[PDB]
Amino acid sequence: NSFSGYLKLTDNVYIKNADIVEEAKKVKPTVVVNAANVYLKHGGGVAGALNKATNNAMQVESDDYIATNGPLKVGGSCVLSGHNLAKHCLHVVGPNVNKGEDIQLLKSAYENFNQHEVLLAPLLSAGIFGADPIHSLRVCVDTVRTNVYLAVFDKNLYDKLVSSFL
Ligand SMILES: CC(C)[C@@H](Nc1ncnc2[nH]ccc12)C(F)F
């Protein structure tokens, strides 16, 4: 958990302009959060990048989890191995608002972070899931009560988030 170069936005939310994969390799946190889908198929966005950095070990493990437990619910999560990136990976499913899933479930998705004291995480539902990234940061700030270090890999978006937050 040796986080460097973060900006503190609130008592418990920190933000950095970095690829979450590079942060995980440098820090080796206790928990890295994945922005997953209900079948844990890590095909693109943050999920594809984290799985690629484990050389598909995350996908093989996720397929075994689904074989034994079935899919997650939207707003739900599971804890799996973090492989070479972290001790654990918290896979969290935010709503895919572009497919009519209710944005109210973004609060349920961020509530899963509260089971862990410290996490390295991305913005949920802000990739191909279509939610406004500044709205996603507002829900994170209003819902997460443990210590969360957010990595955002787009400088243009990082600057808009810091300006809107202060
Ligand atoms: C979730 C998105 C709003 C965000 N993407 C990411 N944020 C942090 N590390 C990442 N690695 C690969 C993708 C990626 C933005 F930068 F595009």
GROMACS .gro file of N, CA and C in nm, residues 4-104:
model
  303
    4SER      N    1   0.194   0.671  -0.404
    4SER     CA    2   0.274   0.791  -0.420
    4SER      C    3   0.213   0.883  -0.524
    5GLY      N    4   0.216   1.013  -0.498
    5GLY     CA    5   0.167   1.109  -0.594
    5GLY      C    6   0.017   1.119  -0.610
    6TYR      N    7  -0.059   1.085  -0.503
    6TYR     CA    8  -0.204   1.102  -0.501
    6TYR      C    9  -0.243   1.239  -0.446
    7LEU      N   10  -0.358   1.287  -0.491
    7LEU     CA   11  -0.417   1.411  -0.441
    7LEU      C   12  -0.536   1.372  -0.349
    8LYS      N   13  -0.536   1.418  -0.223
    8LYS     CA   14  -0.645   1.384  -0.131
    8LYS      C   15  -0.768   1.470  -0.163
    9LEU      N   16  -0.882   1.408  -0.199
    9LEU     CA   17  -1.002   1.486  -0.235
    9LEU      C   18  -1.092   1.501  -0.111
   10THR      N   19  -1.102   1.394  -0.031
   10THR     CA   20  -1.184   1.397   0.092
   10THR      C   21  -1.109   1.322   0.202
   11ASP      N   22  -1.168   1.309   0.323
   11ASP     CA   23  -1.102   1.233   0.430
   11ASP      C   24  -1.058   1.093   0.388
   12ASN      N   25  -1.130   1.032   0.292
   12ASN     CA   26  -1.098   0.895   0.256
   12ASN      C   27  -1.086   0.863   0.107
   13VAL      N   28  -1.090   0.966   0.021
   13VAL     CA   29  -1.080   0.941  -0.126
   13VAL      C   30  -0.958   1.016  -0.181
   14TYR      N   31  -0.865   0.942  -0.251
   14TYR     CA   32  -0.740   0.997  -0.308
   14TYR      C   33  -0.746   0.970  -0.459
   15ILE      N   34  -0.683   1.056  -0.543
   15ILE     CA   35  -0.690   1.035  -0.688
   15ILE      C   36  -0.553   1.062  -0.753
   16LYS      N   37  -0.520   0.980  -0.854
   16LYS     CA   38  -0.396   0.996  -0.930
   16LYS      C   39  -0.422   0.973  -1.078
   17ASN      N   40  -0.343   1.042  -1.164
   17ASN     CA   41  -0.352   1.022  -1.308
   17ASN      C   42  -0.250   0.912  -1.342
   18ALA      N   43  -0.296   0.787  -1.351
   18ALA     CA   44  -0.211   0.671  -1.369
   18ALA      C   45  -0.294   0.557  -1.425
   19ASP      N   46  -0.227   0.461  -1.490
   19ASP     CA   47  -0.294   0.338  -1.535
   19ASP      C   48  -0.303   0.251  -1.408
   20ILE      N   49  -0.425   0.200  -1.369
   20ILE     CA   50  -0.436   0.116  -1.250
   20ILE      C   51  -0.342  -0.005  -1.253
   21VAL      N   52  -0.308  -0.055  -1.373
   21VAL     CA   53  -0.216  -0.171  -1.385
   21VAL      C   54  -0.077  -0.135  -1.338
   22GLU      N   55  -0.029  -0.016  -1.377
   22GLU     CA   56   0.103   0.027  -1.332
   22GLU      C   57   0.106   0.055  -1.185
   23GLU      N   58  -0.004   0.113  -1.130
   23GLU     CA   59  -0.008   0.137  -0.987
   23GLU      C   60  -0.004   0.005  -0.911
   24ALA      N   61  -0.080  -0.095  -0.958
   24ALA     CA   62  -0.079  -0.224  -0.890
   24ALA      C   63   0.061  -0.289  -0.891
   25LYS      N   64   0.135  -0.281  -1.004
   25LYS     CA   65   0.270  -0.340  -1.009
   25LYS      C   66   0.367  -0.268  -0.913
   26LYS      N   67   0.354  -0.136  -0.898
   26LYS     CA   68   0.443  -0.060  -0.810
   26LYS      C   69   0.409  -0.076  -0.662
   27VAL      N   70   0.281  -0.078  -0.628
   27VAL     CA   71   0.237  -0.080  -0.488
   27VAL      C   72   0.211  -0.220  -0.429
   28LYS      N   73   0.164  -0.314  -0.514
   28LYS     CA   74   0.123  -0.451  -0.474
   28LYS      C   75   0.024  -0.442  -0.355
   29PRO      N   76  -0.085  -0.366  -0.375
   29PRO     CA   77  -0.178  -0.342  -0.264
   29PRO      C   78  -0.241  -0.469  -0.213
   30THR      N   79  -0.304  -0.459  -0.095
   30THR     CA   80  -0.379  -0.570  -0.042
   30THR      C   81  -0.498  -0.599  -0.132
   31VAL      N   82  -0.567  -0.489  -0.182
   31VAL     CA   83  -0.684  -0.507  -0.270
   31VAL      C   84  -0.677  -0.419  -0.390
   32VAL      N   85  -0.697  -0.480  -0.512
   32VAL     CA   86  -0.717  -0.406  -0.633
   32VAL      C   87  -0.860  -0.434  -0.680
   33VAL      N   88  -0.933  -0.329  -0.718
   33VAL     CA   89  -1.069  -0.346  -0.763
   33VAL      C   90  -1.073  -0.360  -0.913
   34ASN      N   91  -1.153  -0.458  -0.964
   34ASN     CA   92  -1.178  -0.470  -1.107
   34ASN      C   93  -1.319  -0.420  -1.143
   35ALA      N   94  -1.336  -0.345  -1.253
   35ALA     CA   95  -1.468  -0.300  -1.297
   35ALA      C   96  -1.514  -0.414  -1.389
   36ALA      N   97  -1.581  -0.513  -1.329
   36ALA     CA   98  -1.623  -0.636  -1.396
   36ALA      C   99  -1.767  -0.634  -1.454
   37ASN      N  100  -1.798  -0.739  -1.537
   37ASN     CA  101  -1.935  -0.769  -1.575
   37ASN      C  102  -1.982  -0.895  -1.495
   38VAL      N  103  -2.114  -0.929  -1.500
   38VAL     CA  104  -2.163  -1.038  -1.414
   38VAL      C  105  -2.105  -1.173  -1.444
   39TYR      N  106  -2.054  -1.197  -1.567
   39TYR     CA  107  -1.989  -1.327  -1.595
   39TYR      C  108  -1.837  -1.323  -1.584
   40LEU      N  109  -1.779  -1.213  -1.531
   40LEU     CA  110  -1.635  -1.203  -1.510
   40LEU      C  111  -1.558  -1.234  -1.640
   41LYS      N  112  -1.608  -1.181  -1.753
   41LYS     CA  113  -1.539  -1.199  -1.882
   41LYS      C  114  -1.463  -1.070  -1.903
   42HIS      N  115  -1.331  -1.074  -1.890
   42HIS     CA  116  -1.247  -0.951  -1.884
   42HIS      C  117  -1.193  -0.915  -2.024
   43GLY      N  118  -1.281  -0.864  -2.108
   43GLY     CA  119  -1.248  -0.847  -2.250
   43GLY      C  120  -1.197  -0.713  -2.294
   44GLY      N  121  -1.216  -0.612  -2.210
   44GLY     CA  122  -1.170  -0.478  -2.246
   44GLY      C  123  -1.176  -0.382  -2.131
   45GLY      N  124  -1.141  -0.255  -2.158
   45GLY     CA  125  -1.140  -0.157  -2.050
   45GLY      C  126  -1.044  -0.195  -1.939
   46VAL      N  127  -1.076  -0.155  -1.815
   46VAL     CA  128  -0.991  -0.186  -1.701
   46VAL      C  129  -0.981  -0.337  -1.682
   47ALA      N  130  -1.092  -0.409  -1.699
   47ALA     CA  131  -1.090  -0.556  -1.679
   47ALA      C  132  -0.991  -0.628  -1.774
   48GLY      N  133  -0.994  -0.592  -1.903
   48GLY     CA  134  -0.900  -0.651  -1.999
   48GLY      C  135  -0.756  -0.618  -1.965
   49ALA      N  136  -0.732  -0.495  -1.918
   49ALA     CA  137  -0.596  -0.451  -1.885
   49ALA      C  138  -0.545  -0.525  -1.764
   50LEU      N  139  -0.631  -0.543  -1.659
   50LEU     CA  140  -0.583  -0.615  -1.542
   50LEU      C  141  -0.558  -0.765  -1.579
   51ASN      N  142  -0.650  -0.825  -1.656
   51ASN     CA  143  -0.635  -0.968  -1.691
   51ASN      C  144  -0.509  -0.985  -1.777
   52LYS      N  145  -0.486  -0.894  -1.871
   52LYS     CA  146  -0.367  -0.905  -1.956
   52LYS      C  147  -0.238  -0.902  -1.873
   53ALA      N  148  -0.235  -0.817  -1.769
   53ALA     CA  149  -0.116  -0.806  -1.683
   53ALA      C  150  -0.095  -0.928  -1.595
   54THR      N  151  -0.199  -1.016  -1.580
   54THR     CA  152  -0.180  -1.144  -1.511
   54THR      C  153  -0.155  -1.259  -1.613
   55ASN      N  154  -0.140  -1.229  -1.744
   55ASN     CA  155  -0.122  -1.327  -1.852
   55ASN      C  156  -0.234  -1.433  -1.853
   56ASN      N  157  -0.357  -1.383  -1.839
   56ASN     CA  158  -0.481  -1.460  -1.839
   56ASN      C  159  -0.505  -1.546  -1.714
   57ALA      N  160  -0.423  -1.536  -1.609
   57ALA     CA  161  -0.448  -1.616  -1.487
   57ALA      C  162  -0.579  -1.570  -1.422
   58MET      N  163  -0.607  -1.439  -1.430
   58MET     CA  164  -0.732  -1.387  -1.374
   58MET      C  165  -0.854  -1.444  -1.447
   59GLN      N  166  -0.845  -1.459  -1.579
   59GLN     CA  167  -0.960  -1.515  -1.655
   59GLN      C  168  -0.986  -1.663  -1.624
   60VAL      N  169  -0.879  -1.743  -1.613
   60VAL     CA  170  -0.895  -1.887  -1.581
   60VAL      C  171  -0.956  -1.905  -1.446
   61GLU      N  172  -0.908  -1.829  -1.347
   61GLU     CA  173  -0.966  -1.834  -1.213
   61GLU      C  174  -1.114  -1.787  -1.212
   62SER      N  175  -1.143  -1.678  -1.289
   62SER     CA  176  -1.280  -1.623  -1.294
   62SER      C  177  -1.376  -1.724  -1.358
   63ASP      N  178  -1.329  -1.798  -1.460
   63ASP     CA  179  -1.416  -1.897  -1.526
   63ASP      C  180  -1.451  -2.008  -1.425
   64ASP      N  181  -1.354  -2.048  -1.342
   64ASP     CA  182  -1.377  -2.151  -1.238
   64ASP      C  183  -1.475  -2.100  -1.132
   65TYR      N  184  -1.463  -1.972  -1.094
   65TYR     CA  185  -1.557  -1.912  -0.998
   65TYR      C  186  -1.700  -1.919  -1.051
   66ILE      N  187  -1.719  -1.879  -1.178
   66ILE     CA  188  -1.853  -1.882  -1.238
   66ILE      C  189  -1.904  -2.025  -1.250
   67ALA      N  190  -1.814  -2.120  -1.281
   67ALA     CA  191  -1.858  -2.262  -1.291
   67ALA      C  192  -1.916  -2.314  -1.160
   68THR      N  193  -1.858  -2.274  -1.048
   68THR     CA  194  -1.901  -2.322  -0.917
   68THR      C  195  -2.012  -2.238  -0.851
   69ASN      N  196  -2.012  -2.104  -0.875
   69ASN     CA  197  -2.100  -2.010  -0.806
   69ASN      C  198  -2.208  -1.943  -0.888
   70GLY      N  199  -2.194  -1.945  -1.020
   70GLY     CA  200  -2.286  -1.872  -1.107
   70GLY      C  201  -2.247  -1.723  -1.117
   71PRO      N  202  -2.316  -1.649  -1.203
   71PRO     CA  203  -2.283  -1.506  -1.221
   71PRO      C  204  -2.313  -1.420  -1.099
   72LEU      N  205  -2.246  -1.305  -1.095
   72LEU     CA  206  -2.272  -1.209  -0.990
   72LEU      C  207  -2.403  -1.134  -1.024
   73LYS      N  208  -2.455  -1.056  -0.929
   73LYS     CA  209  -2.567  -0.967  -0.959
   73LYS      C  210  -2.507  -0.830  -0.988
   74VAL      N  211  -2.579  -0.745  -1.063
   74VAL     CA  212  -2.536  -0.604  -1.085
   74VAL      C  213  -2.542  -0.533  -0.951
   75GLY      N  214  -2.434  -0.465  -0.917
   75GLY     CA  215  -2.418  -0.406  -0.785
   75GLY      C  216  -2.347  -0.498  -0.687
   76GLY      N  217  -2.316  -0.622  -0.728
   76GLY     CA  218  -2.251  -0.719  -0.643
   76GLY      C  219  -2.101  -0.733  -0.665
   77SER      N  220  -2.038  -0.826  -0.591
   77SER     CA  221  -1.895  -0.846  -0.600
   77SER      C  222  -1.853  -0.983  -0.550
   78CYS      N  223  -1.728  -1.020  -0.581
   78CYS     CA  224  -1.664  -1.135  -0.523
   78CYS      C  225  -1.518  -1.104  -0.505
   79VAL      N  226  -1.456  -1.168  -0.407
   79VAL     CA  227  -1.311  -1.157  -0.382
   79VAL      C  228  -1.240  -1.282  -0.439
   80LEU      N  229  -1.145  -1.259  -0.530
   80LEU     CA  230  -1.061  -1.362  -0.590
   80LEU      C  231  -0.912  -1.326  -0.571
   81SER      N  232  -0.819  -1.409  -0.622
   81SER     CA  233  -0.676  -1.380  -0.608
   81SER      C  234  -0.640  -1.255  -0.686
   82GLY      N  235  -0.542  -1.183  -0.633
   82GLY     CA  236  -0.490  -1.067  -0.703
   82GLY      C  237  -0.371  -1.103  -0.789
   83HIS      N  238  -0.329  -1.233  -0.787
   83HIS     CA  239  -0.218  -1.283  -0.867
   83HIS      C  240  -0.093  -1.198  -0.844
   84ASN      N  241  -0.027  -1.146  -0.950
   84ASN     CA  242   0.094  -1.063  -0.934
   84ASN      C  243   0.065  -0.915  -0.911
   85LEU      N  244  -0.063  -0.876  -0.907
   85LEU     CA  245  -0.098  -0.736  -0.899
   85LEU      C  246  -0.135  -0.691  -0.759
   86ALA      N  247  -0.181  -0.783  -0.675
   86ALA     CA  248  -0.230  -0.751  -0.542
   86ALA      C  249  -0.247  -0.879  -0.460
   87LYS      N  250  -0.272  -0.869  -0.327
   87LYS     CA  251  -0.303  -0.993  -0.253
   87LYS      C  252  -0.440  -1.049  -0.303
   88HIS      N  253  -0.538  -0.959  -0.320
   88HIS     CA  254  -0.672  -0.993  -0.364
   88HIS      C  255  -0.722  -0.901  -0.474
   89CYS      N  256  -0.816  -0.955  -0.558
   89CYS     CA  257  -0.888  -0.871  -0.652
   89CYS      C  258  -1.036  -0.871  -0.612
   90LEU      N  259  -1.089  -0.750  -0.588
   90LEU     CA  260  -1.232  -0.736  -0.560
   90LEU      C  261  -1.298  -0.707  -0.693
   91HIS      N  262  -1.368  -0.808  -0.750
   91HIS     CA  263  -1.442  -0.784  -0.876
   91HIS      C  264  -1.578  -0.722  -0.846
   92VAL      N  265  -1.607  -0.600  -0.896
   92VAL     CA  266  -1.732  -0.529  -0.867
   92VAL      C  267  -1.807  -0.497  -0.994
   93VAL      N  268  -1.941  -0.524  -0.995
   93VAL     CA  269  -2.019  -0.499  -1.113
   93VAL      C  270  -2.100  -0.371  -1.100
   94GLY      N  271  -2.060  -0.264  -1.168
   94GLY     CA  272  -2.144  -0.145  -1.175
   94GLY      C  273  -2.252  -0.162  -1.283
   95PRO      N  274  -2.359  -0.078  -1.281
   95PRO     CA  275  -2.462  -0.089  -1.386
   95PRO      C  276  -2.408  -0.048  -1.522
   96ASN      N  277  -2.456  -0.117  -1.626
   96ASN     CA  278  -2.426  -0.078  -1.760
   96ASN      C  279  -2.549   0.009  -1.796
   97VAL      N  280  -2.537   0.139  -1.774
   97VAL     CA  281  -2.651   0.229  -1.796
   97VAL      C  282  -2.689   0.239  -1.943
   98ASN      N  283  -2.595   0.210  -2.036
   98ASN     CA  284  -2.628   0.213  -2.179
   98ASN      C  285  -2.719   0.097  -2.222
   99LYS      N  286  -2.733  -0.007  -2.136
   99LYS     CA  287  -2.822  -0.120  -2.159
   99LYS      C  288  -2.942  -0.120  -2.064
  100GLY      N  289  -2.976  -0.003  -2.009
  100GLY     CA  290  -3.093   0.018  -1.925
  100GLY      C  291  -3.082  -0.024  -1.781
  101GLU      N  292  -2.960  -0.059  -1.734
  101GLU     CA  293  -2.946  -0.100  -1.595
  101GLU      C  294  -2.953   0.029  -1.511
  102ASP      N  295  -3.023   0.024  -1.399
  102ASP     CA  296  -3.048   0.142  -1.318
  102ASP      C  297  -2.922   0.204  -1.258
  103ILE      N  298  -2.905   0.335  -1.278
  103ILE     CA  299  -2.791   0.407  -1.220
  103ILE      C  300  -2.790   0.402  -1.068
  104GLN      N  301  -2.908   0.377  -1.003
  104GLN     CA  302  -2.915   0.363  -0.857
  104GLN      C  303  -2.824   0.249  -0.806
   0.00000   0.00000   0.00000
